[PDB]
Design a binder for this molecule. Structure first.
Ligand code: CA
Lengths: 76, 288, 612
């Protein structure tokens, strides 16, 4: 199955600690974010559609909250 | 059905929640002056905005939404699902929901995937991740289970105004949608313009046969009708005689609805070589 | 320069030029084969434009007229999202998010060198400053940042850590300030050349992406509004849209001579450097070399890497070093490589040899890529080769005719040394120091490893049991050890050159070995299915170590030691081929014979070879 940087369609195609996110105009397996690392949070609604450099979701038991501007993965 | 567009741009319903279960209550459009979209920016009810908190789609994104650092959310509306759009379904990999064939395209739309699957003679067409198209004649595209329509809201790589599935989530369409011609034998179904939900191409001449054996009359309605030019026109013909019943062009809009006492009508469409537009969506309803 | 400053910008399938005026003429640059152009820079002196292609995985260049379309870099690139032109030194800098490398070469492409490789996590944008000798780049890691270093990859430091995914890094050279767009917060910020005095220029922008500056204005691109806009660089007001209806505009730039101003020692005679001239902030400049090359004590000239390890994939031949700084493996830029099967290196002339499996030919080229030459062509179907460095020959096995054929480096054939009806020679490794060659004879039902002299005489079966697919061979001439790997049995074994002392080195966590080579006191091997280069200590002091991973389609691996020219000439076949016409053999007592192939016989000269 897919390694880091390999072309994917779904997150199921990638390995255990990776998710399928879009880079330019094709999707590649990128690593899931751990606690402290910067996560995506869209200001405008159209910016979700225009995003061609997608980050993966925060890991198990992590939420994309604001730093204490940018957002980082932090526990509940 | 309250929507006949791919992104619920024509939605004027009464749902004021992001979801009917576990959702958040929407803010009113006549008190969202912090944000771009409100009643002061858009008087005369442009884009369905008014003194209410019902979900809308004025900005031309992939689905209806409302204000609620999360200051907005997509609205999971059950009624807002265009006839032809069979639903948002899960994809767990091997085998996929639709097993016929597949391609990838950096210019992918809902129609370009549909036109590919229709060209290979498959009844269903499914878009995934914005760019991945899938085709098949599989009756069990629902095998992995139905997902919420909000989970199929990744932009189509060709057109940002349309939804094209998501991460392990496939939005399906019947390949009759946006076909240049086709046969319709159901009690009630919808006939779109060629190339829908993209803008209809120039120089198209397409005709759809609506024939319902037993029907005393057929109730034609036009929920969507965006035809640009006077040279562009939608015509209803008597199936038996080929007599032109009605003519609808840019400077002659149809009514809300009208009845034709026939069991056999031929809808026609003619597109000129000047300007393109969103097109139309003719909902018919046979009566016995 | 007297021409007015005009604005260039890349847009996926094409690159277009416009004026600074609002709604003025918009013309595409006549380019060919451009799929997905991303980064963009220029050279006003040469009247040339440079751009990176993330679909092609290349860095190209051409003149403003469209002519002279040539790919400057087209190997070892995954996502070259950042790129910039060193106009003074005549160098091409770029950053790659996929490979995680900030590299540099000449503008034409030769003499590539990696500047930063350790501790990189997706370096996006890139802005040079060869007048001052600094380079600035944005980084898109888990903790995004904007780092600074000298243009020789020295004095690396984080300039502003607290920042999102910064893009369109551009230097205001007149007032000394750095400008960049932020994709997370959707704003254009500005700071001085040390990353302090940080001020927000424009905050109320929907999706600002590309960026550049000129005179007293900044010019940026917007994905949401689909436009190229400008505003006052300091204030952020006096805003005017230059162009509209532009979908997916990647990079934007100002083509003018005043943008590429300043001077350094590298502009004058390339700083007397043999390969690269790299500017630095303290001391003017420093002479760099290509990847792996050693800069000599004079601080000018370079020498190619003394010792290195070559490993080949299906579509490429790589090269790596054993440095303390874990210097990254590069792809050697040979255009002729399509489908390689085996490899071998000639350390005397410093040139690389390989077998093309599809086209069926033994080709030759130096590590640069130039001086390409086919030595064997057709039917003939080469399987594996082994170079006799002393006698100037290649000993190779043919899958078609089933023979050990020997051929000169220049092209002309010596002859067949081993042939049989039932014999099938496949793997081949020579040992001209002792005067023997070792090969796997894959006969039907009974595979076996065999030794023979380099003319085909003194044949003997070393091992005929405990074998299934003898796939790869390797030997150590100093310690006198032979090594072989088995594909089906999943193991690597070892013995003496005689055949005694058969020991299994490793027979666990191995799937498909396809190559062996000895480096100092370590037995390097390659696994195709595991996709890993691994090694074990032959002495048995240190354990099994994984060198690299995730290398798809591994074919063959080969170590290269520096050739000791004095100790080389102590071999009696080194000079004049030992006086022989064809094969030069070494006796057991260190004396040389002269032998011939199958079809020839040794004459009364005991040097020349004639037919029976
Ligand atoms: Ca038209």
């Amino acid at each position: 199955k897919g390694q880091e940087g390999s072309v994917c369609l779904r997150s199921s195609d990638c390995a255990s600690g990776l998710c399928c996110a879009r880079h330019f105009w094709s999707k590649i397996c990128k690593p899931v974010l751990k606690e402290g690392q910067v996560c995506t949070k869209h200001r405008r609604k159209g910016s979700h559609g225009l995003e061609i450099f997608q980050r993966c979701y925060c890991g198990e038991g992590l939420s994309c909250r604001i730093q204490k501007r940018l957002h980082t993965c932090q526990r509940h | 059905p309250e929507c006949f567009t791919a992104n619920g741009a024509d939605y004027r319903g009464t749902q004021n929640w992001t979801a009917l279960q576990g959702g958040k209550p929407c803010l009113f459009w006549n008190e969202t002056f912090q944000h771009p979209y409100n009643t002061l920016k858009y008087p005369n009810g442009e884009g369905g905005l008014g003194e209410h908190n019902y979900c809308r789609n004025p900005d031309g994104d992939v689905s209806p939404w409302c204000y609620v650092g999360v200051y907005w959310k997509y609205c999971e509306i059950p009624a807002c699902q265009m006839p032809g759009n069979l639903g948002c379904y899960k994809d767990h990999g091997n085998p996929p929901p639709l097993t016929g064939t597949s391609k990838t395209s950096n210019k992918l739309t809902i129609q370009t995937c549909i036109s590919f699957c229709r060209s290979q003679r498959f009844k269903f067409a499914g878009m995934e991740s914005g760019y991945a198209c899938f085709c098949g004649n599989n009756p069990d595209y629902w095998k992995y289970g139905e997902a919420a329509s909000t989970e199929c809201n990744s932009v189509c790589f060709g057109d940002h105004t349309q939804p094209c599935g998501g991460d392990g989530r496939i939005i399906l369409f019947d390949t009759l949608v946006g076909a240049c011609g086709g046969n319709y034998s159901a009690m009630s179904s919808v006939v779109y313009s060629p190339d829908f939900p993209d803008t209809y191409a120039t120089g198209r001449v397409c005709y759809w046969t609506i024939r319902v054996p037993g029907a005393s009359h057929i109730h034609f309605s036009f929920p969507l009708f965006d035809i640009r030019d006077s040279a562009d026109m939608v015509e209803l013909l008597d199936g038996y005689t080929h007599r032109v019943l009605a003519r609808f062009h840019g400077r002659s809009r149809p009514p809300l609805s009208f009845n034709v006492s026939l069991d056999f009508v031929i809808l026609y469409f003619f597109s000129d070589r000047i300007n393109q537009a969103q097109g139309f969506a003719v909902l018919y309803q046979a009566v016995k | 320069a007297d021409p007015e400053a005009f604005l260039l910008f890349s847009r996926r399938a094409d690159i277009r030029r416009i004026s600074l005026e609002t709604n003025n003429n918009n013309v595409a640059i006549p380019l060919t084969g451009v799929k997905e152009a991303s980064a963009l820079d220029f050279d006003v002196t040469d009247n040339r434009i440079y751009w990176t292609d993330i679909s092609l995985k290349t860095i190209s260049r051409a003149f403003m007229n469209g002519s002279a379309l040539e790919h400057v870099v087209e190997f070892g690139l995954d996502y070259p999202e950042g790129m910039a032109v060193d106009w003074l030194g005549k160098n091409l800098y770029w950053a790659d998010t996929g490979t995680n490398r900030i590299e540099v070469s000449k503008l034409d492409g030769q003499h590539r060198q990696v500047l930063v490789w350790k501790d990189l996590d997706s370096p996006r944008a890139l802005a040079l400053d060869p007048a001052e000798g600094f380079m600035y780049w944005t980084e898109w890691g888990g903790k995004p940042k904007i780092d600074r270093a000298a243009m020789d990859g020295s004095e690396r430091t984080t300039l502003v850590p607290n920042v999102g995914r910064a893009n369109g890094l551009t230097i205001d050279y007149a007032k000394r300030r750095l400008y960049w767009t932020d994709l997370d917060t959707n704003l254009i910020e500005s700071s001085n050349m040390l990353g302090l005095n940080r001020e927000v220029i424009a905050d109320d922008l929907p999706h600002p992406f590309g960026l550049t500056q000129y005179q007293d204005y900044i010019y940026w691109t917007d994905w949401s509004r689909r436009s190229i806009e400008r505003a006052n660089k300091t204030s952020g007001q006096n805003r005017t849209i230059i162009q509209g209806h532009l979908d997916y505009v990647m990079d934007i730039l100002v083509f003018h001579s005043s943008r590429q101003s300043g001077w350094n020692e590298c502009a004058s005679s390339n700083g007397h450097c043999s390969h690269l001239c790299l500017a630095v902030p303290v001391g003017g400049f420093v002479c760099g070399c290509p990847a792996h090359y050693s800069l000599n004590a004079d601080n000018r000239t370079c020498s190619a890497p003394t010792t290195f390890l070559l490993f080949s994939q299906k579509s490429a031949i790589n090269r790596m070093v054993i440095d303390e700084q874990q210097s990254p493996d590069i792809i050697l830029p040979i255009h002729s490589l399509r489908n390689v099967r085996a490899i071998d290196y000639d350390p005397l002339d410093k040139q690389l040899y390989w077998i093309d499996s599809r086209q069926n030919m033994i080709r030759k080229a130096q590590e640069d890529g130039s001086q390409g030459f086919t030595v064997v062509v057709s039917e003939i179907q080469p399987y594996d080769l082994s170079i006799d460095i002393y006698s100037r020959y290649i000993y190779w096995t043919c899958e078609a005719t089933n023979v050990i054929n020997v051929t000169r480096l220049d092209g002309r054939s010596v002859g067949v040394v081993l042939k049989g009806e039932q014999d099938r020679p496949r793997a081949i490794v020579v040992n001209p120091e002792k005067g023997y060659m070792y090969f796997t004879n894959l006969q039907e039902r009974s595979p076996k490893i065999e030794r023979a002299a380099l003319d085909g005489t003194e044949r003997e079966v070393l091992f005929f049991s405990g074998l299934s697919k003898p796939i790869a061979l390797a030997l150590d001439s100093r310690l006198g050890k032979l090594f072989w790997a088995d594909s089906d049995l999943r193991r690597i074994e070892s013995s003496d050159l005689s055949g005694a002392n058969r020991i299994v080195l490793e027979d666990s966590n191995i799937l498909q070995p396809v190559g062996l080579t000895v480096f100092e006191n370590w037995l390097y091997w390659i696994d195709k299915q595991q996709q890993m280069i691994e090694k074990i200590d032959m002495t048995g002091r240190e354990g099994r170590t994984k060198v690299q991973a995730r290398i798809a389609q591994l074919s063959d691996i080969h170590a290269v030691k520096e050739l000791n020219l004095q100790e080389y000439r102590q071999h009696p076949c080194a000079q004049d081929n030992g006086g022989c016409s064809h094969i030069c053999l070494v006796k057991g007592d260190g004396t040389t014979r002269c032998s011939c192939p199958m079809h020839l016989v040794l004459l009364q000269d005991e040097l020349s070879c004639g037919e029976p």
